[PDB]
Amino acid sequence: RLVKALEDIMVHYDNTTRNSLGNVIQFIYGEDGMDAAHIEKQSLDTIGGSDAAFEKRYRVDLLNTDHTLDPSLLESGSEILGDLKLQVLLDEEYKQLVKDRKFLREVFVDGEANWPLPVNIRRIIQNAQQTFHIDHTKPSDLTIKDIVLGVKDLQENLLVLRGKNEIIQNAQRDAVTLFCCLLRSRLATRRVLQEYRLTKQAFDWVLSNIEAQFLRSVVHPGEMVGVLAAQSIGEPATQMTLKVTSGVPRLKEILNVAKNMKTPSLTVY
Amino acid sequence: LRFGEMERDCMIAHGAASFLKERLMEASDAFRVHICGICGLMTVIAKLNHNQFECKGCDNKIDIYQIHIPYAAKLLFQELMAMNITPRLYTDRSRDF
Amino acid sequence: TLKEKAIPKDQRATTPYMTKYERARILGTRALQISMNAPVFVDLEGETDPLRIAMKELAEKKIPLVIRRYLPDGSFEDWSVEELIVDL
Amino acid sequence: MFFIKDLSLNITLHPSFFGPRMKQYLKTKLLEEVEGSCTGKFGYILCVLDYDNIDIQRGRILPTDGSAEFNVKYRAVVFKPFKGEVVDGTVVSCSQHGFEVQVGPMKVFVTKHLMPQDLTFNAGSNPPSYQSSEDVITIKSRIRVKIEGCISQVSSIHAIGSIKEDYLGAI
Amino acid sequence: VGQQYSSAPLRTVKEVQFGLFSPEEVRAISVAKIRFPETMDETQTRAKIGGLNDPRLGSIDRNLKCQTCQEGMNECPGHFGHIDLAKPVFHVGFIAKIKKVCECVCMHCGKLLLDEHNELMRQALAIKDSKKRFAAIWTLCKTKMVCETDVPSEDDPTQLVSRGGCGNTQPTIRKDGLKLVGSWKKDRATGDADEPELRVLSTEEILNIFKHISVKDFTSLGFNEVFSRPEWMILTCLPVPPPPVRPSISFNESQRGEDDLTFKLADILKANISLETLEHNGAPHHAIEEAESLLQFHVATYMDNDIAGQPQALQKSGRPVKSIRARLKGKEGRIRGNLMGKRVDFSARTVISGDPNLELDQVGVPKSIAKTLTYPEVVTPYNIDRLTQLVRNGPNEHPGAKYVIRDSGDRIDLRYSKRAGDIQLQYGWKVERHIMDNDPVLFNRQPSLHKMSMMAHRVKVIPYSTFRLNLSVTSPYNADFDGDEMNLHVPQSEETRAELSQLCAVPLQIVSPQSNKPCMGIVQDTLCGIRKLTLRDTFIELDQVLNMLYWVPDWDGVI
Amino acid sequence: MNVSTSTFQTRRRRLKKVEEEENAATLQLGQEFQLKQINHQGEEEELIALNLSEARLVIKEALVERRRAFKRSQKKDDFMHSETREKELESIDVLLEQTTGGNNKDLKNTMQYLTNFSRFRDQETVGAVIQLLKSTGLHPFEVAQLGSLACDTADEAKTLIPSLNNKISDDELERILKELSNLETLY
Amino acid sequence: AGRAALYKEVYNVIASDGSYVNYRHMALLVDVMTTQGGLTSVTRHGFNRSNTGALMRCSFEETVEILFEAGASAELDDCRGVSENVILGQMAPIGTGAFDVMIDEESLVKYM
Amino acid sequence: IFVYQNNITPSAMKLVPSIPPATIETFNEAALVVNITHHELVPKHIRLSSDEKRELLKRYRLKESQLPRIQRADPVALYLGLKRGEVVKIIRKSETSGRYASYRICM
RNA sequence: UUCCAGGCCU
DNA sequence: AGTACTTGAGC
DNA sequence: CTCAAGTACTTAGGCCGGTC
Ligand SMILES: [Mg+2]
Ligand SMILES: [Zn+2]
Ligand SMILES: [Zn+2]
Ligand SMILES: [Zn+2]
């Protein structure tokens, strides 16, 4: 029933998801034009943790002896202290990371932080590590500009929908958003240099990978997601070895637009 | 062996375009009839030899097509026809959309 | 009723790369043609097999094939095996 | 008469010929399948024009087997007679029932009963003839006919015509 | 396929236009006058009577003959015949709509019972949708039972205006058997008539009433001026499916066969003849309708036999006689069981037994099947060599082949052809050869409910009669070895295989989207063992380690 | 397989093939020959009536323009003649044996006809005729007939070319006639 | 808010087994139900009634009946439907069939 | 607009389309007690100028139909005084993109 | 071929 | 069997 | 015009005796 009900639902060359009517059924497949195959339980740090801890990890204040980057992590460290121009960028960064906090804590009212997201980033760096034998001892060689300003462009290039106009472009943004959070969560100035002494190269590398590794994760216009989704559901349904109407029968109850549940409940807070 | 529904769905999923068709036709039914370019029926009197194509009644003998479909569907059509149902076939389209 | 064909390579919107299908579909096609005793545009370094030559033609993007991508309505964008990328 | 229509023609090529001399072979094929053809629709196709600019378009590779189908858009000279179209040509054959005049690639036939009666019909004629007070028709003898009717055939639009009206007959 | 080339320019079906035959078309189209009910047999003399079953239509018994069309059996599809009915008969299926349409129009005139004059009507008369419209439309006027000539105009409802005429009250129609009936009225104890006035609706009656229905009214409802005029839901002339739809399964020679259908028609025919003769001759009039309803039955049950008014029209023996509709009816139906799922060539099945010495993506095919399943390979100055080897190598030694096909669409049977040892392949010929080590193949284990319940593996022809597939790929097929079997098909075209190899390979399906995680992975012996192997407390001296090292195909060869 | 030869105008043939007019010099030519046919460029374009000779030129033209592309590749000569009636029957006859399909019997027989019964064996002259005729609102089919059909009286004219009649007056048409029998390239 | 609960409830059906399914799948089906306008059911009555081509719906329960009504209301089928082709024996507008492939003379010359 | 306490005249109501253009909406009291829009599940919608709409189709090569629909009776539909044809931009959170843009046309 | 029946796929 | 639209019916 | 029967439709999917 499921299969015969979704057969003709595929992702067309515009990233729309339709059927023989050309009727839309999802503007951007999966609400993120990504092929489920390339996704792993990433962790969006920028959401949990104490309001306190957040600072200790993402805050970078050059206009301060205790909140600056001890130049053992950075190279241009000492000569940056007080630079009020960099504390502007360094502030937009911290301003944004915090908008994220109050964004994620909004979608994920729950507080949960482990979710399905394209381009595994912990590994993409884990390798970034030993690939350049990076020694945490000696100091990096990036600029508060190198980091902050390159990550900004990393995003400019995680294209999903291509379209040359507002309506389309504005969708692009939407469709990504969440990933990027994950991005700034893990490519934050402090984190970048203090958590894993990322050389200039090492970083410049991690970036390109994240980019194409992303681009690959996108969905291929061709996918017959209808027949897919159906199976993917009706499959773990046959594996359902079964006081509220549970699984198997209930599932049927649903698909039928059950004109009167067996169990009806009504949990009120 | 039978490559029934279950298996079809499977291939669609896979994106296995050609292959599905190949097992649906060449490795099975695969048949050929002639159409009147007008009344989308199998009427045509294919004399594949003197080429005459007539399809009279509709009277053509000039505007005709050859199509490959599964003898099953061919049947399914005469079968629908037998119940006074006309399942016309058109080599082109107009609806656009 | 639009004889207004479709999108000029300029303004094309689709993906810059090739779809897992498009390569699968090309490689096959090209092979099926090479097997048909078609012309081969690489210097086979033996590769007596077609889907090999196909695979190789495809690496020097010397496959004279054009993918006509279709849009949900009818309009289409034309891409050359060259143009398309291959991170597939 | 004689028209020049803009036509087309889907030709399927073998992946075999998927070489560099494709356009080359294609055109050559189109020409094989058109120059000298005939239809009831367009009638006698005579000569394709502008050989140099024959549009081929990107042909599409067929499904199952690798062949390609190209809709070769072309143009050419054609001749399709009509009822009442007045055409004059040279006589060809000639029997007891009438003479067959050839006008262009086509053959219009004139029945005894379709020409003036005073125009007898010489039997012991070498070559066969038809006479009149001051008229003699046979082999060459050019004629001007009025095509009464057409009979589109296999690949040879035939027709019948009279010369019994005025300003019609010999020239 | 269907052999013998035809200059017929060929295409693909793009649109599919559904309609309803016009008795005339049925006529034009028809080649057979179809008069005799009898099968045929020139009265005992074997052949066919120019009556039913090839009075021209397709023919039986390997014979070009087929009203010139020639092309013995395979090629010449059917050639419909017709059979002018005796009296118009409802179409078992449209029945309800024939009623629901009548419940919508008025007799005598054949005009809507709700012109734009009524607003509610417009509301429906504008619901673009040839059905949701005919839905409202009906529900609206299925009540107003008097074809009025006067209604309160688009002005003061005190200055009425006219439209059509004849107000003749209209009877509430109701279903019964295969004929309709309604009951009019006109006052009750007032002036004549009183209670209902039961009158049966004859087809001729109805049919006419529909015919008169207006052109725009046609459409207005939900029909079509060219393909399906209400006036057609009623059969006047009956199209005769030709032999290949009702194949006379003939037992040898001089022995019966005739398909279940061929009977139901012969039935219909007789039932008809009787009717005509009861008219054209001594017509005890209202005793005919008693023998007409019979035709209205056969011609009804012929298409649908599983109805409401029970009488399953048993094929004397109890068999109910398969109605056409039953032929297409879901699952097993021409549709669900023939077109959505066919039986196929180049496929094989056997009991599967797991092997830990194969690569994830291989599949141990028994030599038996390796020599059975072929693959059409074109002769190419690439393989011309290998190929001739296989050919002349015979269809019995494993690496070989059984058929060679020259251009001249004619197959050379290697296992017989007294020139088998000869044969000079021709680049451009084809050589169905044996499935060989590393040909792509679709291997699956129904129930096929997963995308990866059918992955393409590499052939690795082996001995013994079992499909020996790798272990890890056990779980994706939901496969076990306690007597479980598996089907496997063989691609046939260079591009087809390409499609399995480039998209259906096991290495691919390896990480599934129905859960953005891998679906295969180490199990049992390997898993139960991998553990033990690990554990701090577990050491292995040289000798063994050296062997272990060696076993890993790749190993840099450096201890 | 081998398609026919589709034309540039798609009329949606919906079941009802009933109609198909009756070809007549009543200027009721087939639909495939309407004043308003559609140039394969997508743009509209009036019918194209060629009168003898005027057509003979078109043929010989592309027929030779062809003998060149036929040699531009024979690497990777011709160059016209001068009206001589019979001596041309030989000239063209050859040009055929090269650029022609050979068994294209028609095209050859169409040349001998066209070349013998041609009325203005010379380009300029033919353009002259056209400039004259083509400027009468007259349908092409007439513009043709009037061109390739020798005529004297408006009677001989309006008779062999009935369609005319009311169209152009007698004297006027009479003038034009005389104009042709003038331009009528000698022999 | 319905689609919400719809998916919500559906999720728990597959969660009662612990089994995990990527939102996209479930969401899709959940959407295909709601997009229409309200709550389209996955049944002979529900989805298999929408404007899809006749042929397509034909292969799921209304079988004969569905066609009948098609000839009656002279429907038209795009043959955009997966099924449509399958029946027709044509390559279907699916993955490997969502596009055409042509030989571009040009390229086919600059290669040699 | 209007807020009826316990109902209205089945005879009165038949006079809503009595003054076109200017049309009249009917609402119930006990119905507006709580705002549904505020509910944890219902996301924010948004009307669309004939411009914002025609732009939404010109930018998706969509036909009116091909667009996902919202009942004319849809609870939220009335709220924002929806009308047959008007579009809406259902913008909601997402466990995948974080924010999903969706469009609903009116039945 | 067809019609019913029974059976096997932990 | 269960199970969901549809029709028939007393008001 | 608004309420309880009437009225009809699949039921999963491969493979392997007696007599119509
Ligand atoms: Mg088992
Ligand atoms: Zn016909
Ligand atoms: Zn025949
Ligand atoms: Zn009336």
Side-chain angles (χ1 to χ4, degrees), chain G residues 72-100:
Chain G
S73 296
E75 300 185 49
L76 187 47
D77 202 319
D78 316 279
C79 290
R80 296 186 150 193
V82 189
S83 299
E84 327 291 32
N85 302 246
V86 210
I87 294 169
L88 275 162
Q90 320 201 307
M91 185 198 294
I94 284 170
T96 305
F99 54 72
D100 271 316

Coordinates of all heavy atoms in Angstrom, one line a residue, chain G residues 72-100:
Chain G
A72 N -15.4 6.0 -19.7 CA -16.7 6.8 -19.6 C -16.4 8.3 -19.5 O -17.2 9.0 -20.1 CB -17.3 6.3 -18.3
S73 N -15.4 8.7 -18.8 CA -15.0 10.1 -18.6 C -13.8 10.4 -19.5 O -13.0 11.3 -19.1 CB -14.8 10.4 -17.2 OG -15.9 10.3 -16.4
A74 N -13.6 9.6 -20.6 CA -12.5 9.8 -21.5 C -11.3 10.4 -21.0 O -10.8 11.5 -21.5 CB -13.0 10.5 -22.8
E75 N -10.7 9.8 -20.0 CA -9.5 10.3 -19.4 C -8.3 10.3 -20.3 O -8.4 9.8 -21.5 CB -9.1 9.4 -18.2 CG -10.1 9.4 -17.1 CD -9.5 8.6 -15.9 OE1 -8.4 8.9 -15.5 OE2 -10.2 7.7 -15.4
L76 N -7.2 10.9 -19.9 CA -6.0 10.9 -20.7 C -4.8 10.6 -19.8 O -4.8 11.0 -18.6 CB -5.8 12.3 -21.3 CG -4.7 12.5 -22.2 CD1 -4.7 11.4 -23.2 CD2 -4.7 13.8 -22.9
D77 N -3.9 9.8 -20.2 CA -2.8 9.4 -19.4 C -1.5 9.9 -19.9 O -1.0 9.6 -21.0 CB -2.8 8.0 -19.2 CG -2.0 7.6 -17.9 OD1 -1.0 8.2 -17.7 OD2 -2.5 6.7 -17.2
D78 N -0.8 10.8 -19.1 CA 0.5 11.3 -19.5 C 1.5 10.2 -19.7 O 2.4 10.3 -20.6 CB 1.1 12.2 -18.4 CG 0.1 13.0 -17.7 OD1 -0.1 14.1 -18.3 OD2 -0.4 12.7 -16.7
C79 N 1.4 9.2 -18.9 CA 2.4 8.1 -18.9 C 3.6 8.7 -18.3 O 4.7 8.5 -18.8 CB 2.6 7.7 -20.4 SG 1.2 6.9 -21.2
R80 N 3.4 9.5 -17.3 CA 4.5 10.1 -16.5 C 4.7 9.2 -15.4 O 5.7 9.2 -14.7 CB 4.0 11.5 -15.9 CG 3.7 12.5 -17.0 CD 3.4 13.9 -16.3 NE 3.8 14.9 -17.3 CZ 3.9 16.2 -17.0 NH1 3.7 16.6 -15.7 NH2 4.3 17.1 -17.9
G81 N 3.6 8.3 -15.2 CA 3.6 7.4 -14.1 C 4.6 6.2 -14.2 O 4.7 5.6 -15.3
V82 N 5.3 6.0 -13.1 CA 6.2 4.9 -13.1 C 5.5 3.7 -13.7 O 5.9 3.2 -14.8 CB 6.5 4.4 -11.6 CG1 7.6 3.4 -11.6 CG2 6.8 5.7 -10.8
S83 N 4.4 3.3 -13.1 CA 3.7 2.2 -13.6 C 3.3 2.2 -15.0 O 3.5 1.3 -15.8 CB 2.4 2.0 -12.7 OG 2.8 1.8 -11.4
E84 N 2.7 3.4 -15.5 CA 2.3 3.5 -16.9 C 3.3 2.8 -17.8 O 2.9 1.9 -18.6 CB 2.3 5.0 -17.2 CG 1.8 5.9 -16.1 CD 0.4 5.8 -15.7 OE1 -0.2 4.7 -15.8 OE2 -0.2 6.8 -15.3
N85 N 4.6 3.2 -17.7 CA 5.5 2.6 -18.6 C 5.6 1.1 -18.4 O 5.4 0.3 -19.3 CB 6.9 3.2 -18.4 CG 6.9 4.7 -18.6 OD1 7.5 5.2 -19.5 ND2 6.1 5.4 -17.7
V86 N 6.0 0.7 -17.2 CA 6.1 -0.7 -16.8 C 5.1 -1.6 -17.6 O 5.5 -2.7 -18.1 CB 5.8 -0.9 -15.3 CG1 6.6 -2.1 -14.7 CG2 6.1 0.4 -14.6
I87 N 3.9 -1.2 -17.6 CA 2.8 -1.8 -18.3 C 3.1 -1.7 -19.7 O 3.1 -2.7 -20.5 CB 1.5 -1.2 -18.0 CG1 1.1 -1.4 -16.5 CG2 0.4 -1.8 -18.9 CD1 0.0 -0.6 -16.0
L88 N 3.3 -0.4 -20.2 CA 3.6 -0.2 -21.6 C 4.9 -0.8 -22.1 O 5.1 -0.9 -23.3 CB 3.6 1.4 -21.8 CG 2.3 2.0 -22.0 CD1 2.3 3.5 -21.8 CD2 1.9 1.7 -23.5
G89 N 5.8 -1.2 -21.2 CA 7.1 -1.9 -21.6 C 8.1 -0.8 -22.1 O 8.9 -1.1 -23.0
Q90 N 8.0 0.3 -21.5 CA 8.9 1.4 -21.8 C 9.9 1.8 -20.7 O 9.6 1.4 -19.6 CB 8.1 2.7 -22.2 CG 6.8 2.3 -23.0 CD 6.2 3.5 -23.7 OE1 6.0 4.6 -23.1 NE2 6.0 3.4 -25.0
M91 N 11.0 2.4 -21.0 CA 11.9 2.8 -19.9 C 11.3 3.9 -19.1 O 10.9 4.9 -19.7 CB 13.3 3.2 -20.4 CG 14.3 3.5 -19.3 SD 15.7 4.5 -19.7 CE 16.6 3.5 -20.9
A92 N 11.2 3.7 -17.8 CA 10.5 4.7 -17.1 C 11.3 5.9 -16.5 O 12.4 5.7 -16.1 CB 9.7 4.1 -16.0
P93 N 10.7 7.1 -16.6 CA 11.3 8.4 -16.1 C 11.7 8.2 -14.7 O 11.1 8.8 -13.7 CB 10.1 9.4 -16.3 CG 9.5 8.9 -17.6 CD 9.5 7.4 -17.4
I94 N 12.8 7.4 -14.5 CA 13.3 7.1 -13.2 C 14.8 7.0 -13.1 O 15.4 6.4 -14.0 CB 12.7 5.7 -12.8 CG1 11.3 5.8 -12.4 CG2 13.6 5.0 -11.8 CD1 10.7 4.5 -12.3
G95 N 15.4 7.7 -12.1 CA 16.9 7.6 -12.1 C 17.4 7.6 -13.5 O 17.2 8.5 -14.2
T96 N 18.1 6.5 -13.8 CA 18.7 6.3 -15.1 C 17.8 6.6 -16.3 O 18.2 6.6 -17.4 CB 19.1 4.8 -15.2 OG1 19.9 4.5 -14.1 CG2 19.8 4.6 -16.5
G97 N 16.5 7.0 -16.0 CA 15.7 7.4 -17.1 C 15.1 8.8 -17.0 O 14.2 9.1 -17.7
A98 N 15.7 9.6 -16.1 CA 15.2 10.9 -15.9 C 15.8 11.9 -16.9 O 15.9 13.1 -16.6 CB 15.4 11.4 -14.5
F99 N 16.3 11.5 -18.0 CA 17.0 12.4 -18.9 C 17.4 11.7 -20.2 O 17.4 10.5 -20.3 CB 18.3 12.9 -18.3 CG 19.2 11.8 -17.8 CD1 19.9 11.0 -18.7 CD2 19.3 11.5 -16.4 CE1 20.7 9.9 -18.2 CE2 20.1 10.4 -16.0 CZ 20.8 9.7 -16.9
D100 N 17.6 12.5 -21.3 CA 18.0 11.8 -22.5 C 19.4 12.0 -22.8 O 20.1 12.8 -22.1 CB 17.1 12.4 -23.7 CG 15.9 11.6 -23.9 OD1 16.0 10.3 -23.8 OD2 14.8 12.2 -24.1

